[PDB]
Amino acid sequence: GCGELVWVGEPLTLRTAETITGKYGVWMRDPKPTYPYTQETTWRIDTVGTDVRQVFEYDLISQFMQGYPSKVHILPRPLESTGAVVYSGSLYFQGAESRTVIRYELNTETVKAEKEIPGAGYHGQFPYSWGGYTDIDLAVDEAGLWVIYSTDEAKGAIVLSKLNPENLELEQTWETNIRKQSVANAFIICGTLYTVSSYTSVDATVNFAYDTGTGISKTLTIPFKNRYKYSSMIDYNPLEKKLFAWDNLNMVTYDIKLS
Ligand SMILES: [Ca+2]
Ligand code: NA
């Protein structure tokens, strides 16, 4: 049931980090879970610092919300920023100090593919407005895997590319007119890229949309609340049809409605 985004609900806090290491981070579930994982499996990465390698894995939502991890993976190279996703059994993440996306197969703890995103800025060239080296933002939607970035040729405007999830080849690319550094974060729903206006305001908005199917850009005024005033990560999960976000120590989720 696809459609245009028309409403975002209030943020619900599912877990709060207890140390500064989790001031920012990414948490996620797999919209295409494969054995041995399920739709309840949750991953959490606290991303403050310069040697981020620990990925916390929880078999059950109850464990994610109240307990210790059921497994900790140690990535073979340090991860950059909050943009990572899980899709069809693999963590897709950006190597620190690089424009390289890595496919890390979770069950086998193996790197299956690596790809430089052609021309992408990295390490503070085209971050979102809060900084945090957020130059490269992976996304999953109803159609699969994407990457959101910018290039010098695009003059810092958001570029988005569909990715082959097996080998990380770029399949198609679109260029928006939205300055990446001017928005707080972005995500894709049903092939439309949406941006959030502010990472600090309790009265922010989903403020722009770009539809990859029609090429049309629009403004929007949909309310979006940063309850804790520092949102470092905002992604969409197409299986749950919810936003997942990280706001100033807090792992939160938002319900949505589509037309
Ligand atoms: Ca995002
Ligand atoms: Na992402």
Author numbering: 244 to 502
Text taken from the publication that reported this structure:
Inherited missense mutations in the myocilin (MYOC) gene, within its olfactomedin (OLF) domain, constitute the strongest genetic link to primary open-angle glaucoma via a toxic gain of function, and thus MYOC is an attractive precision-medicine target. Myocilin has no known function, and there is no glaucoma phenotype in Myoc knockout mice or in individuals with a homozygous N-terminal truncation mutation or hemizygous deletion of MYOC, but rare non-synonymous coding mutations lead to toxic intracellular sequestration of misfolded myocilin.
These mutations are all found on the protein surface and well documented in the literature. Three of these variants harbor conservative substitutions (Lys to Arg, Ala to Val). Assessment of spent media from cells expressing each of the 16 full-length myocilin variants revealed WT-like secretion for T256M, R296H, L303I, S313F, V329M, S331L, T353I, A445V, V449I and K500R. Analysis of the intracellular detergent-soluble fractions revealed E300K to be a statistical outlier among the variants, but T256M, S313F, N420Y, and A445V also presented decreased soluble protein levels compared to those of WT myocilin. Structural integrity was further confirmed by high-resolution crystal structures, which were solved for 11 OLF variants.
